[PDB]
Design a protein around this ligand. Structure first.
Ligand SMILES: O=P(O)(O)C(O)(C[n+]1cccc(F)c1)P(=O)(O)O
Ligand SMILES: O=P(O)(O)C(O)(C[n+]1cccc(F)c1)P(=O)(O)O
Ligand SMILES: C=C(C)CCOP(=O)(O)OP(=O)(O)O
Ligand SMILES: C=C(C)CCOP(=O)(O)OP(=O)(O)O
Ligand SMILES: [Mg+2]
Ligand SMILES: [Mg+2]
Ligand SMILES: [Mg+2]
Ligand SMILES: [Mg+2]
Ligand SMILES: [Mg+2]
Ligand SMILES: [Mg+2]
Lengths: 362, 362
C-alpha cells in the first residue's frame, strides 16, 4: 500500500533524527549507534502498523471534509505520521518488556528481541526503556510549537500508565488475590475463581484497549484539532469495546493459529494466563472437564498443554466466539451509529478501524 | 532531621493520592493496591534522599532572599517536595531495573526488589515502569496550573533519556565496541583498551550526573521561578563535575566499603564494569600487574575477585583518589565562585550539595 510506504518514510526521518542527535549530542560511537538502529528496526518495524495507520486514517478523514491550504494538509499528515510512530514506539516498548515477562520465543517471525544473542535480557530491559523515551523525544522535537502539545502529552502519559497497570493485572492473573504478597513466592491458583468475564475484562481494558485503540483514535483527533467535534464518551466506549475484541482474537490465536502465520509462538497455557479461552471454557465446562483443566493448565510440559488444547476443541469454543463476536458487532455498529450524530466522518473512520480488526488473520 | 520528615510527609500525601486514584479510577483490588504500596515503599524509601532534599534546599535558599506571602512560601516548599519525589521516583525506577541488569543482591540493606520472593524478575521489570509512570502522574496532578509545567516536563524527559543512554554505555562497557552486534553474543574485552578516563567519563556523565545533580538543581530553580537568575552553563558544569565525583565514590565503595555500611553488595569486579578502580588501575599498573588483572577481572569466582581486590590495594589507589578529589575540590569551588556572580544564594546551595556529597560515608 502506498499510504503505508508514506508512513514508513517518516519512520526513516524520525530514526535519522534520533540517531543524528545521539551522535551530535550524546557522544555515541558508530557501533552503539548501529546497535540502537537495529534495535529500533527489529522492535518497531515488521508489524501490521494498525495503531499507527489508525491515526493517519482519522486525520485523513477530517482532511477530506475540512478547508486547508496545501501546506497545512501536508503538515497535518506529517503530524499524524509522527504521532502514529509515537504509538508504534510505545507499543515496541511494551512488547520488548512483555516478551521477557511472558517467556516468549518469537515475535513478528523473528526471535524476541531479548533472545537475540548479542542482546540478552539485561540489555533488552534498558532497550525497552529507550524506546518509550524516544516517544517523548520525538514529541518535543516534532510538536514543540503545536497547540495540541499539552493535550497529547497528558493523554499519552495516562494511556501509558494504564498499560503498565494492565500489565500488572495480566502478569499476576494466575495468583489468588488474597495470597499476593511481595514477601512470599506466589503459588498459582488452584481454584481459578478469578477466571471470570468481569476480571478478564478489567485486565484487557487496561493492558490493551488504551494504547491499541483509544490513543490512536484520540491522537488522530488532536493532530486534526478536531477533538471538540466528537462525543468523547463514545470514542472511549468504542475504543474499549473494539480493543477488547482485538485481545480476544489475540488470545484465540495464541492457541489455534500456526506460528508460521502468527509470527509468534503461543505461551498463554504454559504461563497460566487469564485468557478468553480459559475463561470461556471455565464458563461452560462440566465438573470433570474442570478437574482435567485444573490438572494440566499452567505447565510447560507439551503433553499437558496438548490436554488443555484438546479440552478447548472439545468444548466447542468457536460457538462461544461466534456469539461473542455477533454481540460485539451489535454494540460497535450501535456506537458507530451514535458517533454519526456529531461526527459522521470520524464514524466512518471507526467503521474502517473495525472492518480491519474484524477481518485480521494475524 | 525535621526537614526530611516534612519531605516524607509529602511522600505519604503522594502515595495516598496515587493509591486512591488506582482504586477510584483503575479498578484495583485491595491486595494489588497493597502490593504496589509495598513496592513504592521498598523502592522509593530508605535512601539518603540526596536528590529530593537537593530540590528542597535550592528552593529554601531562594525563599530566604525573596518576598512572598506566607501561602506562596508554603506552596513553593510543597512544589519543591513534589518535584523532589518525582526525582526520587525516577531514581527508584532506574534502581529497580539496574539491579536486575547488574545481578545485584542487596539494596538499602534489603534484598533487591526483584529478589523479593513474591516479586521475581518479571514483575519487577513492570514495577520499575510503574515507578517512572508515577512521576508523570504526580507531575500533571500537582503542577497542572503551574507556569513551569512545560519547562519541567521537557527537562525531566531529557534527563530520563540521558540516564537510559548512559545505562546502555555502562552495561556494554566490557565489550569491544567494534564487536558489538545484536546478532552475535558479546565476548568480554581482552584488551581493556576502552577502560580510559575519557570513556569512563562519558559513561558516568550520562548514567549519573543528569538525574543525580542537574535535575534536582534545575528543578529547585523551576519551582522557585528562578532559572533566569542563574548562568545555566555553570549549573550544567557544576552538576556534571559533582555528579562525576559522586559516581567515583560509588565505584570505590562497591569494592572497599563493607556491605553492613553500604547497604548494598558490590558487583563491579564480577560484572567487569568500567569503574574508576579498573580505569585508574590500568592507568598506572606495570605490564605484569596488567596481565594478572586481565586473567582475573569479570568473573564471579570469589578467588579471582580476591586477586583483583589485592591488585587494587597494592597499586595504592587511594593516592590517585586523593589527587582526583583535590582536583575536583579545585574545580567545584571555582564554579561556586563563578556562580556567586549572578546568584550568590544558588551558589551557597551548591556549596551545601557539595559539602554533603564530599562527606558521605554511604
Ligand atoms: O500475545 P502478545 O504477547 O503479543 C500480547 O498481546 C502483548 N501485549 C498485549 C497487551 C499489553 C502488552 F504490554 C502486551 P499479550 O498480552 O502477551 O497476549
Ligand atoms: O552502584 P549502584 O548499583 O547503586 C549504581 O550506582 C546505580 N546506578 C547508577 C547510575 C545510573 C543507574 F541507572 C544506576 P551503578 O551504576 O550500578 O554502580
Ligand atoms: C494484543 C496486543 C495488544 C499485542 C499484539 O499487538 P499486534 O498484534 O497489533 O502487534 P504487531 O502487528 O504490531 O506485531
Ligand atoms: C551512584 C548512583 C547514582 C546510584 C546510587 O544512588 P544513591 O547512593 O544516592 O542511592 P540511595 O541513597 O538513594 O540508595
Ligand atoms: Mg506477551
Ligand atoms: Mg503478555
Ligand atoms: Mg497474546
Ligand atoms: Mg547497579
Ligand atoms: Mg549499574
Ligand atoms: Mg555502583
Amino acid at each position: 500500500m502506498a499510504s503505508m510506504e508514506r508512513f514508513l518514510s517518516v519512520y526513516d526521518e524520525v530514526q535519522a533524527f534520533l540517531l543524528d542527535q545521539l551522535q551530535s549530542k550524546y557522544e555515541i560511537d558508530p557501533n552503539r549507534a548501529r546497535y540502537l538502529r537495529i534495535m529500533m528496526d527489529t522492535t518497531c518495524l515488521g508489524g501490521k502498523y494498525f495503531r499507527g495507520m489508525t491515526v493517519v486514517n482519522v486525520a485523513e478523514g477530517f482532511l477530506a471534509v475540512t478547508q486547508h491550504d496545501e501546506a497545512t494538509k501536508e503538515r497535518i499528515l506529517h503530524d499524524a505520521c509522527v504521532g502514529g510512530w509515537m504509538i508504534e514506539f510505545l507499543q515496541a516498548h511494551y512488547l520488548v518488556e512483555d516478551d521477557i515477562m511472558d517467556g516468549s520465543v518469537m515475535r513478528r517471525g523473528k526471535p524476541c528481541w531479548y533472545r537475540f544473542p548479542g542482546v540478552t535480557t539485561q540489555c533488552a530491559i534498558n532497550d525497552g526503556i529507550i524506546l518509550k523515551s524516544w516517544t517523548q523525544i520525538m514529541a518535543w522535537h516534532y510538536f514543540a510549537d503545536r497547540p495540541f502539545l499539552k493535550d497529547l502529552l497528558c493523554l499519552f502519559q495516562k494511556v501509558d500508565y494504564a498499560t503498565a497497570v494492565g500489565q500488572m493485572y495480566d502478569v499476576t492473573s494466575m495468583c489468588d488475590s488474597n495470597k499476593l504478597d511481595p514477601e512470599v513466592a506466589q503459588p498459582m491458583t488452584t481454584d481459578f475463581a478469578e477466571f471470570t468475564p468481569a476480571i478478564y475484562k478489567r485486565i484487557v481494558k487496561y493492558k490493551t484497549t488504551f494504547y491499541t485503540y483509544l490513543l490512536p483514535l484520540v491522537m488522530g483527533l488532536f493532530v486534526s484539532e478536531a477533538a471538540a467535534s466528537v462525543e468523547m464518551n463514545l470514542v472511549e466506549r468504542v475504543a474499549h469495546l473494539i480493543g477488547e475484541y482485538f485481545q480476544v482474537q489475540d488470545d484465540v490465536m495464541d492457541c489455534f493459529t500456526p506460528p508460521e502465520q502468527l509470527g509468534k509462538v503461543g505461551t498463554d497455557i504454559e504461563d497460566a494466563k487469564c485468557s478468553w479461552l480459559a475463561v470461556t471454557f471455565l464458563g461452560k465446562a462440566n465438573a470433570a472437564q474442570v478437574a482435567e483443566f485444573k490438572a494440566n493448565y499452567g505447565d510447560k510440559d507439551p503433553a499437558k498443554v496438548a490436554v488443555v488444547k484438546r479440552l478447548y476443541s472439545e468444548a466447542n469454543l468457536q460457538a462461544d466466539f461466534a456469539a461473542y463476536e455477533a454481540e460485539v458487532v451489535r454494540e460497535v455498529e450501535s456506537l458507530i451509529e451514535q458517533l454519526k450524530v456529531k461526527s459522521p466522518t470520524f464514524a466512518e473512520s471507526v467503521a474502517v478501524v473495525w472492518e480491519k480488526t474484524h477481518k485480521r488473520k494475524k
